[PDB]
Ligand binder design. Structure first.
Ligand SMILES: *[C@@H]1O[C@H](CO[C@@H]2O[C@@H](C)[C@@H](O)[C@@H](O)[C@@H]2O)[C@@H](O[C@@H]2O[C@H](CO)[C@@H](O[C@@H]3O[C@H](CO[C@H]4O[C@H](CO)[C@@H](O)[C@H](O)[C@@H]4O[C@@H]4O[C@H](CO)[C@@H](O)[C@H](O)[C@H]4NC(C)=O)[C@@H](O)[C@H](O[C@H]4O[C@H](CO)[C@@H](O)[C@H](O)[C@@H]4O[C@@H]4O[C@H](CO)[C@@H](O)[C@H](O)[C@H]4NC(C)=O)[C@@H]3O)[C@H](O)[C@H]2NC(C)=O)[C@H](O)[C@H]1NC(C)=O
Ligand SMILES: *[C@@H]1O[C@H](CO[C@@H]2O[C@@H](C)[C@@H](O)[C@@H](O)[C@@H]2O)[C@@H](O[C@@H]2O[C@H](CO)[C@@H](O[C@@H]3O[C@H](CO[C@H]4O[C@H](CO)[C@@H](O)[C@H](O)[C@@H]4O[C@@H]4O[C@H](CO)[C@@H](O)[C@H](O)[C@H]4NC(C)=O)[C@@H](O)[C@H](O[C@H]4O[C@H](CO)[C@@H](O)[C@H](O)[C@@H]4O[C@@H]4O[C@H](CO)[C@@H](O)[C@H](O)[C@H]4NC(C)=O)[C@@H]3O)[C@H](O)[C@H]2NC(C)=O)[C@H](O)[C@H]1NC(C)=O
Lengths: 208, 209
């Protein structure tokens, strides 16, 4: 019957304070005469009550699904206190509790590298760019690219890829133009990953 | 209770060489116990072919039942637009789980392929990375290999297909090799293959040039 799913926030959300990251709790398989639950949290054994819970969001397939937030002061996560959701509903015998904290590991400083494009693209009238990122733990990460001060969106970035050194890697791509590049300017690769001098790093190089 | 059936395609590796024959498979899930087994009444958009090996029932941890249905096929009828089929007759429930699959229809594209050398920042690293980029392709059924002086480089890693711009896709590919052995002039060869490619195969290959 009732199953329970909770989720840690996005890396990008943990790596900047401007958005408090949210450890979230979620429940489906909840019928009607099956009283709503309370989202008892327990941070390492601390009955904190910052929950920005919402009501039961019903479903087409007839499931009173519910949610509830618990934001956290970012630091508690960079060392990952042990968090716990808990269910307070008449229904399944007794509650459901699922601990969650960033997977252990002495993290690693990533290796960011910008790679200018090649000759079979140079010639093409619109050319793309690569910021390889290797050897970092954990895969919890985010990346952006920005064109000389003002940022960008015209870029994509592949979800990570397991790599035999216990550490991950990944790439991205910027579809810049002839107009911008050879006509004098560089571009910047922004890399948010905890274990680094201010986590964020930026790389950049131009015509050379 | 809710007997299900699911259909399956062949890997984008098993349809780019005929040494391998593409495997097409039909999976019967969550049967019932005293239910008799089933019959596989295949087709090919209308051709009840009979070359589909049947393995007797295989129970499942949840004390349930499942079966499978294989298909050795053709690197042709599968790459032109022939919609294959499957069907189970079962005393389970009044049902013929009439199912079909096509090739991922849609216009095939022209995937551009490049190799990228280590960054000036990487250099003084013990081992070394080297990159294969592929962009501008539809569909995403594309395979990748890396090699050197002919020899097969198996020690490589692959970034799964990702979406991009023009409705097309892309994917990068990475390799770690001895910077030492590197500096002594050794070309390295990315080598992809995808549907409507030149002979369904092009590779680029470079080194310290
Ligand atoms: C009735 O309807 C509800 C509501 O959903 C509706 O119907 C479904 C079919 C979809 O069409 C919905 O769009 C639609 O609204 C159904 O509830 C759905 O079904 C089950 C639960 O019943 C859930 O499956 C789990 O999904 C989580 C991932 O959570 C994401 O799931 C979907 C995307 O993957 C997406 O639908 C969800 O919204 C949710 O998306 C996340 O949302 C948060 C919240 O904002 C957001 O922050 C995230 O960014 C976003 N993430 C993504 C990726 O989009 C998944 O984690 C679960 O996998 C675990 O459990 C599996 C078995 O359940 C197991 O096979 C997996 O391997 C994995 O196992 C876990 O593994 C780790 C490590 O090994 C371990 O620590 C865990 O303990 C272990 N867990 C277990 C159990 O083993 C799982 O797949 C759906 O998410 C859920 N969707 C919603 C919206 O509630 C319901 O099923 C319907 N019933 C019927 C009969 O149809
Ligand atoms: C009782 O047990 C059985 C047996 O399960 C087994 O035993 C348990 C105890 C555990 O050990 C399990 O780990 C183990 O599987 C249960 O039977 C299962 O039933 C579920 C349905 O609820 C099936 O889920 C399907 O999942 C496939 C995903 O494809 C991969 O899934 C598995 C990942 O490991 C893998 O086992 C599968 O084989 C398959 O992986 C590929 O398999 C082929 C084999 O033919 C192999 O050659 C490949 O190499 C292998 N590759 C990889 C990478 O694994 C999925 O296709 C189905 O999802 C469809 O439907 C979902 C909604 O139900 C939807 O969310 C999905 O997106 C997808 O939707 C389809 O999407 C396509 C394209 O977008 C669209 O065209 C379709 O219209 C659309 N259809 C629908 C309906 O949405 C499906 O969910 C399990 O595969 C199956 N397992 C087995 C072994 O049979 C049974 O559920 C148990 N009962 C209970 C109550 O728990």
């Amino acid at each position: 019957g009732p199953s329970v799913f909770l989720f840690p926030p996005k890396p990008k959300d943990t790596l900047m304070i401007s958005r408090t990251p949210e450890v979230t709790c979620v429940v489906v398989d909840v019928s009607q005469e099956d009283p709503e639950v309370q989202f008892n949290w327990y941070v390492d054994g601390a009955e904190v009550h910052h929950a920005q819970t919402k009501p039961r969001e019903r479903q087409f397939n007839s499931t009173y699904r519910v949610v509830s937030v618990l934001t956290v002061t970012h630091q508690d996560w960079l060392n990952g206190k042990e968090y716990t959701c808990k269910v307070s509903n008449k229904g399944l015998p007794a509650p459901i509790e699922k601990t969650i904290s960033k997977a252990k590991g002495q993290p690693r400083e990533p290796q960011v590298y910008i790679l200018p494009p090649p000759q079979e693209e140079l010639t093409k009238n619109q050319v793309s760019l690569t910021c390889l990122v290797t050897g970092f733990y954990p895969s919890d990460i985010a990346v952006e690219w920005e064109s000389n001060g003002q940022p960008e969106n015209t870029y994509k970035t592949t979800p990570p890829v397991l790599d035999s050194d216990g550490s991950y890697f990944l790439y991205s791509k910027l579809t810049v133009d002839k107009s911008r590049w050879q006509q004098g300017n560089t571009f910047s690769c922004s890399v948010m990953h905890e274990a680094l001098h201010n986590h964020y790093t930026q790389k950049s190089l131009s015509v050379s």
